[PDB]
Amino acid sequence: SLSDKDKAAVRALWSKIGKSADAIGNDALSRMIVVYPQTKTYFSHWPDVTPGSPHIKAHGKKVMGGIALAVSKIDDLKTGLMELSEQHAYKLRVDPANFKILNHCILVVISTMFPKEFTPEAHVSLDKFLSGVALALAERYR
Amino acid sequence: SLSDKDKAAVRALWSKIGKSADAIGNDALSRMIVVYPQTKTYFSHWPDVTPGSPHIKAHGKKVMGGIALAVSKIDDLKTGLMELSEQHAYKLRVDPANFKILNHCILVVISTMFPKEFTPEAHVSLDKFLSGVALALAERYR
Amino acid sequence: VEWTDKERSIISDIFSHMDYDDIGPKALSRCLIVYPWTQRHFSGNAEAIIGNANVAAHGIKVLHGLDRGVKNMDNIAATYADLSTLHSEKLHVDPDNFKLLSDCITIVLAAKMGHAFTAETQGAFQKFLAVVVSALGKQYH
Amino acid sequence: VEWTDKERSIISDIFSHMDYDDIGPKALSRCLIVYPWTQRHFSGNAEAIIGNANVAAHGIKVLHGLDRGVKNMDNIAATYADLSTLHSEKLHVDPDNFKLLSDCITIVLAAKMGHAFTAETQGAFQKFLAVVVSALGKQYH
Ligand code: HEM
Ligand code: HEM
Ligand code: HEM
Ligand code: HEM
Secondary structure (H helix, E strand, O other): OOOHHHHHHHHHHHHHHHHHHHHHHHHHHHHHHHHOHHHHHHHOOOOOOOOOOHHHHHHHHHHHHHHHHHHHOOOOHHHHOHHHHHHHHHHOOOOHHHHHHHHHHHHHHHHHHOOOOOOHHHHHHHHHHHHHHHHHHOOOOO | OOOHHHHHHHHHHHHHHHHHHHHHHHHHHHHHHHHOHHHHHHHOOOOOOOOOOHHHHHHHHHHHHHHHHHHHOOOOHHHHOHHHHHHHHHHOOOOHHHHHHHHHHHHHHHHHHOOOOOOHHHHHHHHHHHHHHHHHHOOOOO | OOOOHHHHHHHHHHHHHOOHHHHHHHHHHHHHHHOHHHHHHHOOOHHHHHHOHHHHHHHHHHHHHHHHHHHOOOOHHHHOHHHHHHHHHHOOOOOHHHHHOXOHHHHHHHHHHHHHOOHHHHHHHHHHHHHHHHHHHOOOO | OOOOHHHHHHHHHHHHHOOHHHHHHHHHHHHHHHOHHHHHHHOOOHHHHHHOHHHHHHHHHHHHHHHHHHHOOOOHHHHOHHHHHHHHHHOOOOOHHHHHOXOHHHHHHHHHHHHHOOHHHHHHHHHHHHHHHHHHHOOOO
C-alpha cells in the first residue's frame, strides 16, 4: 500500500515531469511494442504501429493521461481507475499480464528523460504506485 | 480486490476445510521446502526439516492459523496482517517472492485433501484471497 | 534440465495412469474460471464452461501434446517449437497463459491423485511442465 | 537464444562504452533502495547505501561478471554455472533477486544513455540480461 511518504513522492515527481507526459507515453508505447512483441496485436487495427507512427503518438497521450488520472486518484486507485479497468477487461480484452510490462517501459522512459529527478527514492515510490495502478486495472478481470 | 461474493466463498470453504488446518499446513510447508529449495534456508535452525519432521508439523499449525486469522480479517487484510508482515520483513527477513510460492503449495494441498469442495469457483476466490494475503504480508517490506 | 532416472520414472508413471479425457477438460475449464481472461480463446458461466465441448476438446489436445514431451524428455524445446509459433503467431495466446494453465493442470492432478501426489511427485511434474511452458512461451535462456 | 549479428553488435557497443565504476554501484544501490529486502546481503538509509563501499565493490563485480557473458554469448548458461552455485549455496541469494537487479541495471543504463537507449537497444540489452538471470537463478528450460 502507498504511504503518505509514497504519495507525496509521486505527486512531487509528477509535478516535475508531468509537462512531458505526451512524450513519455509515445516513447513507452513504442518500446513496449518492439521489446514485448506479444503486445503488438492489441494495436493491429492501426494503420501504422512503429516507433515513428502518428497513432502511437496520439495514444501515448491517452496512456499518460490515464497515469495523470491515477496520480489525482492516488488515495483510491480502485475507484479512480474502475472505468479504465472495465474497458481493458471487457471491451479490449487486454491480457492483464501486460500491465506490469508497460509500467516497466514507463520507468525506463522516465529514466532516459529525467535522470536527475528519477532518483532511487523517486523510483521506489513510483514503482509501488505503478504496481497499485496495475492491480487497480486488474480489478474487473476476475 | 475481494468482492462480497469472494468473501462469502472463502468463508464457506474455510468453514468446510478449517478442521484440517493443521494437516494442511504441515503438508504445504513440507512441499514448499522440497519443491522450492531456496526456501529451506529460513528453517535451517530446526534440527529436522523433512516432510516427516516434528518442527515442520508444529510450524504448519502456525502457518494455517495465520491463514485462519486472514479469513477473520478478510475485510481489511492490511490491518489484520500488519504484525505478521512486520515479523517476516524485519525479524525473519523472508524474501517476499516466497509468499506466492507457499500460497501455491497451500492450493495444491487443499486440492489433494478436498477435491469435492475445491471447485473452480472456490479456487478463483481463494486465489484472489491468497494474492491479497501475499500483498498484505508484503506491506512492511518497502 | 538434466533428468534423474527417478524423475523420468515419476513422469512416465503419472502420464501412464492419467485419464486424459477426464483431466484435460477439467484443467482447461478450471483455467478458464480461475483466470477468465483466457476464455477469449474458446469463445472461438462456470457451469457453461465446464460442459463446453470446445473447451474439452482442446483440454484433451493439451494432454496429448504433453505426451510427445514425455516421449523425448531431452528434446523438449525443439519438440514444441512449432506449437509455440502456432499459439503466438496464429492464435495470439499471451505467453503468460501457459504458466497459468500449467498450475491448473497440477492442481487438477493433485485432486485426482490425492495423497499419492507427494512432494517429490509434485516437484518432478512441475519441473516437466516448466520446461514445456518455457518452450511454448519462448522464454530467453 | 540465437543471436542476430545486430544484437551482438549492440551488446558489444553498450559494454565497451559503459563506465563500470559508475554504473555498477548505481545499479546495486538502486536495487537496494527499490527492493530493500536485498540489503540483507550487504550488511554482510538511502544516502548511506549509495555511498557504501561494500555495495559499490559488488556492483562493480556484477558488471565485470556480465563481461564474460558478453565474451561468449553462445555459452552463457555454462559460463555462470559456478557463480550460480555460489550465490544460492553459499550466499543464499533468492533467485528472484537477479531479475530485480537486472531491471535496475537497465534503468541506470537508460539514465546514462538517455535517448541513445532506443527500443532496439533496450530489447537487445534486456535479452542478454534475461539469459544471464536464467543461468544465475537456474531456471528450468
Ligand atoms: C499503465 C497502464 C495503462 C493505462 C493507464 C492505460 C490507459 C488507457 C486509456 C486512457 C485508454 C483510452 C481509454 C478510453 O478510450 O476511454 C486506453 C485504451 C487502450 N489501451 Fe490501455 N492503458 C494501460 C495499459 C494497456 C496495455 C498494457 C495494453 C496492451 C498491451 C493496452 C491496450 C489498450 C488499447 C489497444 C486501447 C485502445 C486503443 C485504440 O483503439 O485506440 N492498455 N488505455
Ligand atoms: C501464507 C503465508 C504465510 C503465513 C500466513 C505465515 C504465518 C506465520 C506465522 C503465524 C508465524 C509465527 C509468527 C509468530 O511467531 O508470531 C510465522 C513465522 C515464520 N515464518 Fe511465516 N508465514 C507465511 C509465509 C512464510 C514464507 C513464505 C516463509 C519462508 C519461505 C516463512 C518463514 C517463516 C519462518 C522461518 C518463521 C519462523 C519459524 C520459527 O523460527 O519457528 N513464512 N509465519
Ligand atoms: C501446455 C500448453 C498447451 C499445449 C500442449 C497445447 C496444445 C494444443 C494443440 C495440440 C492444439 C491443436 C494444434 C494444431 O491444430 O496444430 C492447440 C490448439 C489451440 N490452442 Fe493450445 N495448447 C496449450 C495451451 C494453450 C493455452 C493456455 C491457450 C489459450 C488460453 C490455448 C489455445 C489454443 C487454441 C485457441 C487452439 C485452437 C483451437 C483448438 O485446436 O482446440 N492453448 N493447442
Ligand atoms: C547479474 C547478477 C550478479 C553477478 C554477475 C554477480 C557477480 C558476483 C561476483 C563476480 C562475485 C564475487 C564472487 C566470487 O568471489 O567468486 C559476487 C559476490 C557476491 N554476490 Fe553477486 N552477482 C550478481 C547478483 C547478486 C545479487 C542480486 C545479490 C544479492 C542481492 C548478490 C550478492 C552477492 C554477495 C553477498 C557476494 C559476496 C560479497 C562480494 O563479493 O561482494 N549478487 N557476485
